[PDB]
Amino acid sequence: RYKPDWESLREHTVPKWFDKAKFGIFIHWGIYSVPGWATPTGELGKVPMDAWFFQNPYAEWYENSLRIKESPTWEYHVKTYGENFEYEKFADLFTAEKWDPQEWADLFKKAGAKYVIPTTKHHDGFCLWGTKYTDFNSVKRGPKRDLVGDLAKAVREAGLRFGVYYSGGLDWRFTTEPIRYPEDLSYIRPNTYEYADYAYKQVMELVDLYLPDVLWNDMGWPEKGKEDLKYLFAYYYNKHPEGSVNDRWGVPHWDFKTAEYHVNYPGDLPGYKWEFTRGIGLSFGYNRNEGPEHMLSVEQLVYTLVDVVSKGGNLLLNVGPKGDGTIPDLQKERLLGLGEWLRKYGDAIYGTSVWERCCAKTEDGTEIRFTRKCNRIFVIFLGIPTGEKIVIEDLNLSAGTVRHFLTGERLSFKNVGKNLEITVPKKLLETDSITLVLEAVE
């Protein structure tokens, strides 16, 4: 048994399956998905925090933006829904009438994802399962359906791992004042013993009802409730050893760390398991204002995943569905394109380990990322070189044998000074999709 204390919980380390999975889907879906609107201002880490809450690109922060009068959101809301339409009222319009979980799980599997994590309760405090601790949930209002439960069955049926996202740190059902500056987060929080019990009970309920593969908390854990985590994590791991927990609880233990857009993104191998998270666009919740100008292209998604993976992380890519339960085509296209590249190069991604270095670049600037599997070293070019002579800056190989990953075709190479030169016949180069992938073997 794991015991209820940090020294003992330290024994649990990130499970094998998570380390090997590399790619998962995040799903931010809630009553905010109905207005589904935000100012697509920019990437977290690049927008000045003096403006951020006032021009918030995270559409799921709609209620908070709505409480800031004379915020683009406030204006949009009054013209669209009216001054007398309270935010909570959206739970009645959140009907998920066109929702088909098996259809979601299938798309996620086709996309190459090995795990799925939906928002069981985001900052607005509305719960997507039949919790017994509040009536502001999807069984009693809106869909009249246990979304978490139904989605979990669907994802598992598809053979994918299922985790849960819970907003332990924020619950706007316990505050009245909006967050306007980062500073406000230090005091506009539920704060009561009551809320700390609520959060503990709700996560315990998620563990009991769905035994998730990942407990993904956000925004820290209520100070008054932090000690409870020793008990909750021991309870969880004892029921599910292969379960995992992220790093946003504000306590000693965690199985993997997280980075969001520019925030906490590692420049090199970090030395611990981590996971990068971002929306396909700038929001997590569905944003009707985003167009392709705001989203990653398939090529960019692939480069993202590869960079993240070569630095030891998993990519937890977010999808933001509509109030009706459908996934916007802009997002679907991208998921399928990524899936297509993973069907082809999966073997250089899935189940891989980091190598001695994550990165290299060609003489003319083509970035290169490395992954490994025992003695086999995968060389992933972010893009496909045009010529056949290829010069890799600052790399020597002691493999004696380098092959073209897609064909298996052995290739010609030599250590030329502090560099590595290789010849790739344009006919092979012509077969690669978004990345030229070579495979060395020492």
Place this chain on the structure above:
Amino acid sequence: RYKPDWESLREHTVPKWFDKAKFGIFIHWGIYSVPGWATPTGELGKVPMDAWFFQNPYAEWYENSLRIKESPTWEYHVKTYGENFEYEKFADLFTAEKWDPQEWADLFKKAGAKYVIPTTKHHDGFCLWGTKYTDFNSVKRGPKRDLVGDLAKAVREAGLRFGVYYSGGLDWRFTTEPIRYPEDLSYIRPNTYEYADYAYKQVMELVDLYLPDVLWNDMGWPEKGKEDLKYLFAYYYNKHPEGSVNDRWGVPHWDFKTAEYHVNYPGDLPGYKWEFTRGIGLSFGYNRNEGPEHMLSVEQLVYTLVDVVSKGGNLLLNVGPKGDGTIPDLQKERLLGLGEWLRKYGDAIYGTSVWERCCAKTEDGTEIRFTRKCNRIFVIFLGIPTGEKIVIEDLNLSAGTVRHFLTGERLSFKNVGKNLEITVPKKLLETDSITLVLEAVE
């Protein structure tokens, strides 16, 4: 922003308006106002604490006195209302049928008060506003009206500041046993996490609904909830910088200290902002047993205010209304008499600062109090000397020019040894009301 920590909250100091206001009205009004009865035993600080709770002169402690069987209150209650009439039942008789807030605010303005503070919830736990945290409040029972809200609108309309009194330390809705000796207060308290959340939520609600100018807590704050105060005070000050908080929370921060009847009354200038509080009689809640023998006379009120003001404090004088919402004539007379003296000498009170010393006395014992405004020094005699030669013991002046405050008439004076001698023509002396006021200028 103020941050949620004592070092940061230390930045907030008592607002200018409070320092300059000098006089405010306290209002203890609740369901205890209906029986409106107590043994007018004496002044707090003068009654032996071995008798106090058994012969309690604070009529608002009626429920506690009622729980002590064979207490004068218990006897009175049984003969008047019956053994089977529970205290809570008074919320149904508390109807405030003759209540007119604008009439109260007007009387308070005429009385010279610059701020008003009613009991939003006293020790019996009954709430005079539509709190969502209990049904034992004035909207659901008794008046079927938000007294706090309605009074706040009225006081503001009158141009007066509005604060709130909250009983954080005691709530007899969470105990069954009465307080019989001071010692009992150390353990007969709500004590739960639940009550600590309740108190925090209720004060947060008062801040949200009415944004008061003063948070006046009484009887300390629940131990389990003390840390919450960092968050509540930062939240409050960030919404209302010119807001203020008293010293009865039992935590590091406070904007002004308090003294009650003899308790904590300063003998000289104390070095910090404070406020003296007392009833016009011996009770705060309306007491039908008090007659004029038990109340301060206008002259005494004036002497009180002047003494307090000259020592840097504000006087927070209590009015105890009846169950019907009316203010007893004995109290009204006194408020108006004080008002009349303030209309005449306000300038030597309002907006003043302390001088080098608060006090002096004449050769024949007439007490003298000093206040200041830049270079002008007000000399207030508690009473009006009969002769014209006046000798002030242990005072020298370096003003060269002393005037009679009401007329402006320059007067004759000289430093005669360790004393100050001045001649005030009986015709001027004959114009002063309760106090001879001179005005020096160095």
Place this chain on the structure above:
Amino acid sequence: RYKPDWESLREHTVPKWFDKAKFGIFIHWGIYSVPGWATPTGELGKVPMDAWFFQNPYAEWYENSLRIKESPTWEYHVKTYGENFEYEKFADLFTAEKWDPQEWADLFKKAGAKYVIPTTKHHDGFCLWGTKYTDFNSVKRGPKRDLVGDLAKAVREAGLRFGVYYSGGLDWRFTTEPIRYPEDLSYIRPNTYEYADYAYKQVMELVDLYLPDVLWNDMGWPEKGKEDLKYLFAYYYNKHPEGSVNDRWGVPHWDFKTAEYHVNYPGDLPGYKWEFTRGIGLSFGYNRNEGPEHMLSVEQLVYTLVDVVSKGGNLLLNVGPKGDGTIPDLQKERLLGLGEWLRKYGDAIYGTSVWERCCAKTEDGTEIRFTRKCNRIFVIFLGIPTGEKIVIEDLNLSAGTVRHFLTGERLSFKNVGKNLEITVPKKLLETDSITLVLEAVE
């Protein structure tokens, strides 16, 4: 009597004398003054923190810099003194041969400072009084003399207040590794209970031997000793109620806050008493590498003092003496120039209060600052306008009379709209020194 608890200690506020003084002299003098060397990189707040400790402009940090091999300091040191020359050896070369405390105190009085505060122990742990808790002090090594005591006697004889600076948060006699990045400050500290005791005993000793007017701590207080400050502060204030403490203790109590170079510098009225400190140059300890290019000019010193005072602060200007005890000419001249300015304009500085706004500016870019003394409002221009026509933006006066400070000459003005226009006769303008000053009365 103050009791040893934060609630009680809050009763003590900044004493009058400190609020009215406005200008004090800081003295960083120690064995680091012997080598007197630093690379003058720039001002704190503007030099990138990843470079700061590697090219530290604070010459008093010489020892820390010496501990970073191949840092400008290391190279300089080895070339000048050799590798076999440990930092501590400077305690013996520290002889203060030409030191004359009365000359120092005369100079500070001429400069217009009203208080003086020498480093009793800086980060290197060397003590400049005969402490009984360490032999690494000035009585036993170098000067063979009680520098603190002798200076206090001279300062007090000159009529000035005397404080003490003590590095409670850092002591390099208890660590080996140097600070290279700001983050190091979180773990490279003495850390022991023994150090917490030592610090306590040393500050208590300073209170016992010299009863300073200000306890100026730096770099926070040892975590293990924080609770000790309740006792130390109560002990200090009960012996000296007009004593004061700054805000670098990291506990709930402080009498005035501080800002250093750009750090925590307020852009407008803060709402609490504070004090600004900086070197005449970019270092506190004497740096023989600085030239006038690195120093504030008398005019800038004057503008610094005016901006600071208008914002309610005091300026604590640092002078960095030489190992021999003499004050470099570049620093002595600026002290003098500032003293000259204070002799003419002091009445618009000493004893003033903040006005409604700290700042304004003329239609042509000349900045303005305000100070107050009752009904008198000082208008201080940071420079001397060339034309007799002066348009102050976004300002209106209801004074009726505006004089020209140095001559007293009533002047012609009128609120022309959202502005205020005044005519200053070139004859007057030409009489002012660094700042044109007007005085307005309401």
Place this chain on the structure above:
Amino acid sequence: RYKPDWESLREHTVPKWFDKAKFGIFIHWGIYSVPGWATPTGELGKVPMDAWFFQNPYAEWYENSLRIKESPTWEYHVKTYGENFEYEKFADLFTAEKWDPQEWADLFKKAGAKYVIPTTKHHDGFCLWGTKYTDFNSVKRGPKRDLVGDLAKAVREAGLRFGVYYSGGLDWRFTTEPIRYPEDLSYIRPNTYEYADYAYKQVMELVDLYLPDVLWNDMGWPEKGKEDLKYLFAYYYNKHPEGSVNDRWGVPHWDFKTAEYHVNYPGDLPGYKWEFTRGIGLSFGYNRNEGPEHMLSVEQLVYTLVDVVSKGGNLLLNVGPKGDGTIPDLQKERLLGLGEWLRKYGDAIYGTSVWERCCAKTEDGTEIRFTRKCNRIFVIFLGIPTGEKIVIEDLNLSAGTVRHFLTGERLSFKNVGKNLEITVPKKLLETDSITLVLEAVE
């Protein structure tokens, strides 16, 4: 950079080198080595704890045993040395006359150890480096020499890693009463803040002087000093990221856990890195009373190492030198025998990982252990089967090919049901040393 907090320190995991090393040498050497005497009662975990301290088989506990009047040790001591001969006197007889650190390091390298860890200070408080915090150390007494430093230099020159063992939880220089029962350990400890500081300063000093590869603490850490470990650990890892700490600190962080004799020994895959330690005999300190009857034989040493490694651990085998610095022949021979075995079979040990199961057994009772190196699975029998027909119970392979490790000879096998059958040609069998080893590939 690691920050001084448990959450941040969790980012540091067991370094690769420690995981791959598998075998290290422990050295308990101190003044207790002079008397070198203990009653060899039995193994920890099997001797009743109500007798254990009274007939302690750990000769390094000599002083504690001496403090129990009429314990075998007391009687022995008095007969051999006399009553007027205090334990501390052995510090002077501790001369290490024949000590040669390079011979030790040569021997450990031959034995196949990849790291070495000497006792820098055991329970008796005697230090074997020239610490500046006590005079009871090897530079000032006995050896007149820095044992730790000199040994580190020799170990590192031989290519091995160097760690340090420090008795942070016990120091008999700070107590008088001996431990008689396990319960005593709860209150008979130094207990003072001074001791907590001393321990901190001593481990910091070891990090500063030798930057060990492993900080091996024993008996927990002083309660008053636990919070110090956040700083010490961050300080250590920021200077040496490949450094490591064990799990005897009693705080949230550790890089590998430990088991001693029977205590905490795992029966199967634990799921975290750990290390097993034991003496060649029943004592850590040299015990001249032990004969080969009390020692593991080379074969048992080999079986211990295999069981340990198959379970993911490292074996930390203790050798107990004599006061003169020589290693008893009984211990030197076993080290050698083990080294011989590691030279032949090392490739199935160093650098391996655990497989799906640690263990198996042949139909006839011969135990089996598995280790892994990618696709290669080592099958290590604890002994050499006599017949060429080998039936392994409850095992099936999907490898297709199984070689005989030392010769490489492909072998005949087939899953006969719930078992696996392999034919090992007596010619091969007869070539193996202590263990038959097969290698299987998938």
